[PDB]
């Protein structure tokens, strides 16, 4: 006898994941400002094979970086750090309309920073 | 507790 | 779906820095005294939908007090802030609480001791008991280290919505989009950005 | 457009007001912001209070009438007595009238509670000014108007609540001592009449809103009224029965009974004892029948968060703990009260299971009170056996991570007591919990840690034979549990917990050498495990065991050929090969703890030599090739190697202190040469690249070297026992290596650690090197002062260390300031006062102490020219600078030490400790006493700084102040009275006779 009983990134693949702190440059104040600390993920869309950076803040999970790893971008060192990269971004959509930024991302060690440049350049080719 | 010597993490 | 939050406490306790961290993620090192009040909408994504806080960040310095208890009219929730490195700021918690519950007789209130990142802490855990008889939630927080920085809003969201299982959840991450007359413009801004040292280079991140 | 209300030549357009107000409260963005600035400028107009009657009459906006009352509040509290007596009577009348008219319109009474509460508080401000001397009929007329209207009677309860709060709860800071006593006396005189009204309302009333507001006011009365009003009336019966049944009144009634549990009560009247038992009996009865039985799952109820359940359970916890901490003995001897006693504690057991950190802390504090009492009080513990048995399980299951430090120590204390009270029950609970980890029924990462912490926390409570059987059984079961699992993650947790328990039972380790050996060798094996956390666990456990068991590493054990420390040192390279540098330093530090247990000098120094063999060879190499070509120091790898060598020396020196001296001498002279070479490179790099060079990894790496060298020297000197060698071997090379380098570097390249290092040198050997202290001041004083005297913000580290150094120099080698050129001694005084004005507590507190200590140094010099010149030059600078921070409202954190310094300054003159006149021959008749001149200087100073005070106020304040300059507590009250009076106009000068 039968008794009756009682995000938006699921189409992507995580190529690289690393903990980091992200800064944005306020040129009008010649001052770096923190934007978020959390996991930085290189996400590969299965239906286009395009790779983006997606980064969320801990606890609140709010997006602090969402943009394509464009092949034109270039990772530059910052004068006061051997574990960070600086680079300009022309279209980030973490906070609404696509906007341009000079970003800086820092990691826990120079090792993680270099590996990030590895993966970041690998991903740059994937986007071509 | 000489079985401590065989304590392994694997 | 928005709720008025008033934020009160002594000058220098970190009220504006705490809100700013939530608004932009930045940590402001400078102390620029709030004048009267600053209102900032703050939205959180929950499994019950987005909840909007209209934060009234009031001034703690008396000579900048502005409308004082007039800022509390029709608040639906509140945060009282003090500084665990300054006893006087905790001694003044009952005065802010008095001025607050005279205007706002039954609202969820969070008591926050800020700056627990500083080694030489002066208001010891065991001395903090004012919240017990006043039915306030209490949290140690640090706007600098982000220790417990989300707890005051999570607890208030739960009280205001009436769901003790409400959780923060990940906002959906849309696919991001894809001229030569600005290559030299971004090169100027980039040369400056590289030669401005990153702050707090001794932090783990 | 909105800025029109700010024009007072024209009438006030109420409609423009209500639009500005609305744009602020309901508006948004720029419009809201603009209206805010307007409303603040309007409210801050010193004439705006005149237009308050217009708003209260012809506005329709309650927010605007609220702002009107705020403008009035400012005026009543700050300027009342300056008004023509006409306005005072007028304002009073149309505040009284506005309140009556709001209470009579049941519609307004219902919907404008915020505006009515504000009006009540505004009325209460008037009472603080005018009542009872100019209003003796207020209370009788309030009691009369209560019977004519429920809404007015309810609102009179709110007026009295606020009055009680303003007079008894919040007067200490806001009124003078005299004015507070006057109002407390006045309310006390007429309370009989107030209590009558309050008790009638409670016994007869049926309007719950009226009831609740009466009980709200009662809560305030219980802070101060005499007990007879509570125990000689029926009111306990009402509170503990009638008002516990209605959920409306239940929350307020419970808080009232909590306060009643704190009344000042004679502890020898048997009837009052029965009354205290009875109202507890009733309250528990109402809870069991109207709220929930003692079996209810309060954890689940709290988690559901229906209605006000969470607040109610908090308030019940506070009630039960408050009452039982004071009165449980009342229930412990009468057999008819046993059920009541144990039901009350069973509710606390259930409350203690709620998941809510702060509530758990409240109940945990009570449990501490109880189990401490059962531990000492004869014949009590058997009463509570079943309560305590449940508590053991609650505390074990909610154990928090040790090292939330405070909560763990409180949990440990209660559990240690509970173990003494029944060891057998405790042991059985812990073993049982352990089986349900093995059998998987309660297995989890969280649950196995919680239990290991609990087992670890009771170390020292069992007998050594029971402990021995217990420890064995625990490890045995744990080992089998680790085997039982798979995957690094699982096996990692169990293996860690195993080491945690072991680390907590040193008495067992000391008696089982072979076991201790096996432990350590396993930690060593784990120092090669790359799984996240294993290595940190291995090192922390190693040093923790060493701090406790060091003697067993330094003697030769039976069946061993050498002390085990030698076996650790031999394989140290292998043991630590995979550790990160931080972890290596902990290891070396742990070895230094063992080596300091060896009291034979020759063997201790040999062990020291062998331990430092690897860093000393890497050191010799580097010093050889570092000096060859100073290029290497640009190699980040050599810089990292150097800093890690120094850090290893700091770690070992931290363990060994005075014993570390031989190793210091092996590196000291070359280390100071290295300090200089690194210094040149930093300077050379800042020249070639600019100040931005200080932010680069290379320079930060070089500065790290300098900092660790200073930390090493500081660490040794702060612990040295042979100070002859410190002075005659260490100090001179050190000063030559660091002082000039600091003085002659640009501000952004000076290390504040140099200051901290010098503070220690002065601390331990300052008395022996007066020429060295002078050299220190010469090299750091002026150039550091110029860094920190432009704002309160820049160079925060230099700021703090600067005043720590001046403080210690002022204590230990005050002669150095005597030798300063007069220009530089004046900068020293300027620098002390600069410190006064910081809000940074680190700086402010040392600035006041230096000022105090300096005055004492000067006083001890006697009647000599330098002391006489000091008072002539600087006495009044210190009196007036101290008065400034006392009265400016931005340095309240330093009141006490400002008061002390001020009391010392004033006492010098009223004890005739100052030999020369403090004035000019000209400006005062010959022969005038410094006492008279001081009182004149201060009267003039305060008259210009606080021109709104009367001459009489100032004169009474100074007479009181100087009279009381030997009684710090009274002196401080007079200062606080003064701080109240400068906030208003018209302060009563007789207030300053309060002490008299
Ligand atoms: N170390 C530390 N500093 C903090 C923290 N939070 C704020 N601060 C600092 O404390 C100072 C005061 O910050 P602020 O937000 O302006 O305090 P406030 O309560 O808004 N003051 P006001 O009432 O006058 O507006 C700032 O220097 C800020 O960087 C913290 O969590 N940790
Ligand atoms: Mg602010």
Take residue D706 and report the two structure tokens written for it: 């300098």
H or E segment to which residue D172 belongs: helix D171-174
Residue whose CA lies nearest to ligand 1 atom number 30: C115
CB D539 within 8 A of CB D591: no
Instruction: Give the burial class of D640: count Cβ atoms within 10 A of its Cβ; 0-12 exposed, 13-18 middle, 19 or more buried.
Output: middle
CB D520 within 8 A of CB B4: no
CA-nearest of C95, C23, C29, C30 to C57 is: C23
Please spell the DSSP secondary structure of D122-135, one letter per residue: HHHHHHHHHTTTT-
Q: What are phi and psi of D60, to 5 degrees?
A: -105, -5
In angstroms, rounded to a whole number, what is the distance separating the alpha carbons of residues A89 and A67?
8
CB D907 within 8 A of CB D965: yes
In angstroms, the Cα distances linking D242 to D13, D203, D279, D280, D293 are 52, 9, 12, 14, 19
- Cβ contact, residue pair C205, A106, below 8 Å: yes
3-state secondary structure of D820: coil
- Residues of chain D found within 8 Å of residue C201, distances taken between Cβ atoms: 695, 700
H or E segment to which residue D88 belongs: helix D85-104
Residue C13 sits in a domain of what CATH number?
3.40.50.300
H or E segment to which residue A78 belongs: strand A76-78
Instruction: Give the burial class of C174: count Cβ atoms within 10 A of its Cβ; 0-12 exposed, 13-18 middle, 19 or more buried.
Output: exposed
Best of D471, D525, D536 to disrupt the B interface by mutation (most B CBs within 10 Å)? D525
In angstroms, rounded to a whole number, what is the distance separating the alpha carbons of residues D995 and D118?
35
Chain position carrying tokens 């309810």? D154
Please spell the DSSP secondary structure of D346-408, one letter per residue: HHHHHHTTSS-HHHHHHHHHHHHHHHHHHHHSTT-GGGGHHHHHHHHHHHHHTPPPP--HHHH
Take residue C37 and report the two structure tokens written for it: 């009040």
Technique employed here was: X-ray
Of A79, A81, A82, the CB nearest to D692: A79
CA-nearest of C154, C153, C183 to C166 is: C154
Is the minimum CB–CB distance between C151 and chain D shorter than 8 Å?
no
Ligand 2 centroid distance, CA of D842 (Å): 23
Residues 6+ apart with CB under 8 A from D185: none
Please count the residues of chain A.
Answer: 128
Q: Rounded to an integer, what is the distance from CA D204 to the centroid of its chain? A: 47
CA-nearest of D239, D248, D224 to D280 is: D239
Please spell the DSSP secondary structure of D839-893, one letter per residue: --HHHHHHHHHHHHHHHHHHHHT-S-HHHHHHHHHHHHHHHHHHHHHHHSSS-GG
Residues 6+ apart with CB under 8 A from D379: none
Take residue D718 and report the two structure tokens written for it: 């702060």
In angstroms, the Cα distances linking D27 to D20, D33, D64, D683, D880 are 9, 9, 15, 57, 48
Residues 6+ apart with CB under 8 A from D90: none
DSSP state of A33: E
Beta strands C2-9 and C77-83 are parallel
Instruction: Report how many domains make up chain C.
Output: 1
DSSP state of C54: E
CB D121 within 8 A of CB D74: no
CB D175 within 8 A of CB D128: yes
Instruction: Give the burial class of D159: count Cβ atoms within 10 A of its Cβ; 0-12 exposed, 13-18 middle, 19 or more buried.
Output: buried
* End-to-end Cα separation, chain B, in angstroms: 20
Strands across the sheet containing C49-58: C37-46, C49-58, C2-9, C77-83, C109-114, C137-140
3-state secondary structure of D461: coil
Take residue D834 and report the two structure tokens written for it: 């600069």
In angstroms, rounded to a whole number, what is the distance separating the alpha carbons of residues D889 and D360?
38
Residues 6+ apart with CB under 8 A from D293: none
CA-nearest of D288, D167, D169, D154 to D215 is: D154
Of C66, C122, C164, the CB nearest to D305: C164
In angstroms, rounded to a whole number, what is the distance separating the alpha carbons of residues C95 and D222?
20
H or E segment to which residue C15 belongs: helix C15-24
In angstroms, rounded to a whole number, what is the distance separating the alpha carbons of residues D532 and D244?
55
In angstroms, rounded to a whole number, what is the distance separating the alpha carbons of residues D183 and D186?
5
Cβ–ligand 1 contact at C119 (below 6 Å):
no
Ligand 2 centroid distance, CA of A34 (Å): 19
Minimal Cα–Cα distance from D472 to chain B, Å?
Answer: 7
Chain position carrying tokens 């009452």? D323
In angstroms, rounded to a whole number, what is the distance separating the alpha carbons of residues D201 and D208?
10
Q: What is the dihedral of CA A30, A31, A36, A37, to 10 degrees?
A: 130
Ligand 2 centroid distance, CA of C39 (Å): 11
CB C82 within 8 A of CB C112: yes
Cβ–ligand 1 contact at C89 (below 6 Å):
no
In angstroms, rounded to a whole number, what is the distance separating the alpha carbons of residues D735 and D676?
12
Domain boundaries A1-128, corresponding CATH code: 2.30.29.30
Question: What are the domain boundaries of chain A?
Answer: 1-128
Take residue D305 and report the two structure tokens written for it: 């968060």
CB D878 within 8 A of CB D854: no
Q: CA triplet D704, D707, D711: central angle to 5 degrees?
A: 135
DSSP state of D263: S
Taking the CA of residue D173 as centre, how many other CA atoms within 13 Å lie in the half-sphere pointing to its CB? 11
In angstroms, rounded to a whole number, what is the distance separating the alpha carbons of residues C131 and D194?
30
3-state secondary structure of D2: helix
How many C-beta atoms surround the C-beta of residue D769 within 10 A? 20
In angstroms, rounded to a whole number, what is the distance separating the alpha carbons of residues D931 and D919?
11
Total H helices, total E strands in chain C: 6, 6
- Residues of chain D found within 8 Å of residue B9, distances taken between Cβ atoms: 488, 491-492, 495, 526, 529, 531, 534
* Chain A and chain C touch, per 3+ beta carbon pairs within 8 A: yes
CB D103 within 8 A of CB D109: yes
H or E segment to which residue C189 belongs: helix C183-195
CB D840 within 8 A of CB D872: no
Take residue D509 and report the two structure tokens written for it: 């380790």
CA-nearest of D548, D544, D543, D605 to D568 is: D543
Q: Rounded to an integer, what is the distance from CA D832 to the centroid of its chain? A: 26
In angstroms, rounded to a whole number, what is the distance separating the alpha carbons of residues D650 and D635?
23
CB C107 within 8 A of CB C76: yes
In angstroms, rounded to a whole number, what is the distance separating the alpha carbons of residues C132 and A108?
40
Is the minimum CB–CB distance between C2 and chain D shorter than 8 Å?
no
Q: Which residues of C16-31 are buried (b: 16+ CB within 10 A; e: fewer)?
A: bbbbbbbebbbbbeee
In angstroms, rounded to a whole number, what is the distance separating the alpha carbons of residues D122 and D131?
14
Beta strands C77-83 and C49-58 are unpaired
In angstroms, rounded to a whole number, what is the distance separating the alpha carbons of residues D27 and D20?
9
CB C203 within 8 A of CB C144: no
H or E segment to which residue D188 belongs: helix D177-189
H or E segment to which residue A66 belongs: strand A63-68
- Cβ contact, residue pair C176, A80, below 8 Å: no
In angstroms, rounded to a whole number, what is the distance separating the alpha carbons of residues D735 and D733?
6
Q: What are phi and psi of A77, to 5 degrees?
A: -70, 160
Instruction: Give the burial class of C5: count Cβ atoms within 10 A of its Cβ; 0-12 exposed, 13-18 middle, 19 or more buried.
Output: buried
In angstroms, rounded to a whole number, what is the distance separating the alpha carbons of residues D186 and D131?
8
In angstroms, rounded to a whole number, what is the distance separating the alpha carbons of residues D877 and D883?
10
Take residue C15 and report the two structure tokens written for it: 């009220």
In angstroms, rounded to a whole number, what is the distance separating the alpha carbons of residues D826 and D853?
16
CB D642 within 8 A of CB D705: yes
Which range of residues forms the domain containing residue D635? 1-996
Q: What are phi and psi of D799, to 5 degrees?
A: -50, -55
Chain position carrying tokens 């912001």? D33
- Cβ contact, residue pair A106, C195, below 8 Å: no
Resolution for this experimental structure (Å): 2.3
CB D18 within 8 A of CB D27: no
In angstroms, the Cα distances linking D667 to D664, D672, D713, D723 are 6, 9, 11, 19
In angstroms, rounded to a whole number, what is the distance separating the alpha carbons of residues D216 and C106?
14
In angstroms, rounded to a whole number, what is the distance separating the alpha carbons of residues C14 and D269?
52
Of C168, C177, C193, the CB nearest to A61: C168
CB C73 within 8 A of CB D25: yes
Is the minimum CB–CB distance between D474 and chain B shorter than 8 Å?
no
CB D33 within 8 A of CB D44: no
CB C68 within 8 A of CB C99: yes
CB C142 within 8 A of CB C105: no
Of A9, A100, A104, the CB nearest to C173: A9
DSSP state of D916: S
3-state secondary structure of C6: strand
Residue whose CA lies nearest to ligand 1 atom number 14: C14
Q: What is the dihedral of CA A34, A38, A42, A44, to 10 degrees?
A: -120
CA-nearest of D513, D395, D369, D509 to D457 is: D395
Neighbours of chain D (3+ CB pairs under 8 A): A, B, C
Which range of residues forms the domain containing residue C166? 1-205
Please spell the DSSP secondary structure of D424-451, one letter per residue: HHHHHHHHHHHHHHHTSSS--HHHHHHH
Chain D residue at shortest CA distance from C111:
D358
Please spell the DSSP secondary structure of C100-113, one letter per residue: HHHH-SS--EEEEE
Report helix angle D138-146 to D191-204, nearest 10: 10
Cis peptide preceding D132, ω within 30 of 0: yes
Q: What are phi and psi of A63, to 5 degrees?
A: -70, 130
Instruction: Report how many domains make up chain D.
Output: 1
CA-nearest of D944, D931, D938 to D956 is: D938
């Amino acid at each position: 006898i039968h008794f009756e009983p009682v995000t938006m990134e699921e189409d992507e693949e995580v190529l690289y994941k690393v903990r980091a702190k992200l800064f944005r440059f306020d040129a009008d104040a010649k001052e770096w400002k923190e934007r978020g600390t959390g996991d930085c993920k290189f996400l590969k869309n299965k239906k286009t094979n395009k790779v983006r950076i997606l980064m969320r803040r801990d606890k609140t999970l709010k997006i602090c970086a969402n943009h394509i790893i464009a092949p034109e971008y270039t990772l530059k060192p910052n004068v006061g750090s051997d574990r960070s990269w600086v680079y300009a971004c022309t279209a980030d959509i973490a906070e609404g309309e696509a906007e341009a930024f000079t970003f800086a991302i820092r990691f826990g060690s120079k090792e993680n920073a270099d590996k990030f440049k590895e993966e970041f350049e690998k991903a740059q080719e994937i986007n071509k | 507790l000489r079985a401590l010597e065989r304590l392994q993490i694997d | 779906v928005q709720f008025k939050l008033v934020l009160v406490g002594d000058g220098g306790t970190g009220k504006t820095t705490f809100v700013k961290r939530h608004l932009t993620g930045e940590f402001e090192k400078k102390y620029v005294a709030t004048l009267g009040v600053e209102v900032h909408p703050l939205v959180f994504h929950t499994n019950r939908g987005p909840i909007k806080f209209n934060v009234w960040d009031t001034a703690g310095q008396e000579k900048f007090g502005g409308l004082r208890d007039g800022y509390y009219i029709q608040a639906q929730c509140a945060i009282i802030m003090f500084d665990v490195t300054s006893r006087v700021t905790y001694k003044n918690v009952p005065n802010w609480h008095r001025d607050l519950v005279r205007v706002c007789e039954n609202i969820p209130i969070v008591l926050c001791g800020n700056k627990v990142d500083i080694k030489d802490r002066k208001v010891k855990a065991k001395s903090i008991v004012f919240h017990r008889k006043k039915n306030l939630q209490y949290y140690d927080i640090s706007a600098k280290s982000n220790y417990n920085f989300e707890k005051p809003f999570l607890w208030l969201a739960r009280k205001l919505i009436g769901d003790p299982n409400l959780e923060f959840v990940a906002m959906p991450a849309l696919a991001p989009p894809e001229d030569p007359a600005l290559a030299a413009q971004y090169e100027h801004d980039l040369e400056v950005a590289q030669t401005t040292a990153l702050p707090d280079e001794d932090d783990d991140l | 457009s909105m800025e029109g209300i700010l024009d007072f030549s024209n009438d006030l357009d109420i409609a423009l007001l209500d639009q500005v107000v609305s744009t602020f409260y309901q508006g948004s963005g720029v419009q809201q912001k603009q209206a805010q600035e307007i409303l603040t400028k309007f409210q801050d107009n010193p004439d705006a209070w005149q237009k308050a009657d217009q708003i209260l009459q012809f506005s329709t906006n309650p927010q605007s009438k609220f702002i009107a009352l705020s403008i009035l509040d400012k005026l009543i509290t700050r300027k009342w007595k300056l008004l023509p007596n006409d306005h005072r009577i007028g304002i009073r009348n149309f505040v009284v009238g506005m309140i009556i008219s709001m209470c009579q319109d049941d519609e307004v009474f219902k919907t404008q509670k915020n505006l009515i509460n504000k009006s009540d508080l505004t009325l209460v401000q008037i009472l603080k000014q005018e009542w009872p001397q100019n209003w003796p009929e207020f209370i009788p007329e309030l009691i009369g108007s209560s019977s004519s209207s429920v809404n007015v009677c309810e609102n009179n309860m709110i007026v009295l609540k606020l009055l009680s709060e303003e007079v008894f709860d919040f007067s200490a800071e806001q009124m003078t001592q005299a004015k507070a006593l006057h109002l407390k006396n006045s309310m006390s005189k007429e309370f009989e009449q107030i209590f009558k009204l309050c008790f009638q309302v409670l016994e007869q009333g049926s309007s719950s809103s009226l009831i609740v507001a009466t009980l709200e006011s009662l809560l305030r009365y219980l802070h101060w009224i005499p007990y007879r009003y509570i125990y000689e009336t029926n009111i306990l019966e009402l509170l503990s029965t009638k008002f516990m049944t209605s959920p409306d009144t239940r929350a307020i009634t419970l808080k009232c009974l909590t306060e009643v549990s704190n009344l000042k009560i004679p502890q020898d009247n048997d009837l009052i004892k029965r009354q205290t038992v009875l109202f507890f009996q009733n309250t528990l009865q109402q809870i069991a029948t109207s709220v929930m039985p003692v079996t209810a799952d309060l954890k689940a109820t709290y988690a559901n968060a229906n209605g006000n359940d969470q607040s109610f359970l908090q308030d019940l916890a506070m009630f039960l703990t408050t009452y039982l901490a004071r009165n449980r003995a009342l229930l412990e001897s009468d057999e008819s009260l046993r059920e009541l006693l144990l039901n009350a504690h069973q509710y606390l057991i259930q409350l203690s299971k709620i998941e809510e950190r702060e509530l758990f802390k409240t109940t945990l504090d009570y449990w501490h009170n109880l189990v401490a009492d059962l531990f000492y009080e004869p014949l009590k513990k058997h009463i509570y056996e079943e309560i305590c048995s449940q508590l053991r399980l609650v505390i074990i299951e909610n154990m928090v991570r040790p090292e939330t430090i405070q909560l763990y120590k409180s949990e440990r204390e209660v559990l240690v007591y509970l173990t003494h009270l029944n060891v057998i029950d405790t042991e059985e609970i812990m073993i049982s919990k352990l089986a349900r980890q093995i059998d998987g029924s309660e297995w989890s990462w969280h649950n196995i840690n919680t239990l290991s912490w609990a087992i670890g926390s009771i170390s020292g409570t069992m007998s050594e034979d029971t402990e021995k059987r217990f420890v064995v059984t625990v490890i045995k079961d744990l080992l089998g549990l680790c085997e039982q699992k798979r995957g690094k993650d699982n096996k990692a947790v169990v293996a860690s917990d195993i080491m945690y328990v072991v680390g907590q039972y040193p008495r067992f380790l000391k008696a089982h050498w072979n076991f201790l050996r096996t432990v350590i060798l396993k930690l060593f094996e784990f120092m090669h495990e790359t799984h996240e956390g294993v290595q940190d666990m291995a090192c922390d456990t190693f040093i923790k065991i060493v701090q406790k068991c060091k003697y067993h590493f330094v003697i030769q054990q039976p069946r061993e050929s050498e002390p085990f420390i030698q076996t650790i040192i031999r394989d140290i390279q292998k043991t630590t090969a995979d550790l990160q540098p931080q972890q290596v330093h902990t290891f070396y530090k742990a070895c230094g703890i063992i080596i300091s247990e060896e009291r034979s000098v020759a063997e201790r120094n040999r062990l020291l030599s062998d331990l430092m063999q690897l860093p000393n060879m890497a050191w010799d190499t580097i010093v050889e090739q570092s000096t060859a070509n100073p290029t290497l120091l640009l190699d980040s790898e050599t810089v990292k190697i150097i800093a890690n060598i120094i850090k290893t020396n700091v770690a070992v020196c931290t363990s060994m202190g005075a014993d570390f001296y031989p190793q210091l001498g092996h590196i000291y002279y070359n280390m100071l040469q290295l300090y200089r070479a690194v210094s040149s490179m930093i300077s050379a790099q800042v020249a070639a690249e600019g100040l931005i060079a200080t932010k680069t990894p290379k320079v930060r790496g070089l500065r790290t070297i300098k900092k660790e060298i200073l930390k090493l020297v500081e660490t040794y000197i702060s612990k040295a026992r042979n100070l002859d060698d410190v002075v005659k071997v260490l100090v001179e090379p050190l000063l030559n290596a660091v002082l000039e380098d600091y003085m002659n570097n640009v501000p952004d390249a000076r290390d504040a650690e140099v200051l901290n290092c010098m503070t220690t040198v002065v601390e331990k050997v300052g008395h022996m090197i007066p020429q060295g202290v002078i050299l220190i001041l010469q090299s750091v004083f002026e150039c550091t002062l110029d860094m920190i005297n432009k704002d309160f913000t820049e160079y925060p580290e230099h700021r703090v260390e600067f005043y720590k150094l001046l403080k210690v120099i002022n204590e230990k080698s005050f002669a150095a300031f005597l030798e300063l050129p007069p220009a530089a001694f004046k900068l020293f005084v300027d620098a002390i006062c600069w410190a006064f004005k910081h809000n940074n507590r680190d700086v402010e507190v040392n600035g006041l102490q230096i000022a105090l200590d300096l005055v004492k140094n000067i006083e001890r010099m006697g009647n000599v020219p330098f002391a006489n010149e000091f008072h002539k030059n600087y006495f009044f600078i210190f009196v007036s600078e101290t008065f400034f921070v006392l009265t400016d409202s931005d340095h309240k954190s330093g009141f006490s030490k400002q008061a002390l310094l001020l009391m010392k300054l004033i006492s010098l003159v009223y004890d005739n400790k100052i030999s020369v006149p403090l004035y000019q021959e000209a400006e005062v008749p010959q022969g005038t006493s410094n006492q008279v001149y001081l009182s004149q200087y201060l009267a003039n100073m305060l008259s210009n700084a606080f021109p709104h005070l009367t001459s009489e106020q100032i004169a009474s304040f100074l007479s009181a102040l100087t009279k009381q300059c030997k009684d710090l507590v009274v002196f401080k009250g007079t200062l606080r009275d003064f701080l109240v009076q400068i906030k208003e106009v018209g302060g009563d000068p007789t207030d300053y006779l309060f002490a008299e």
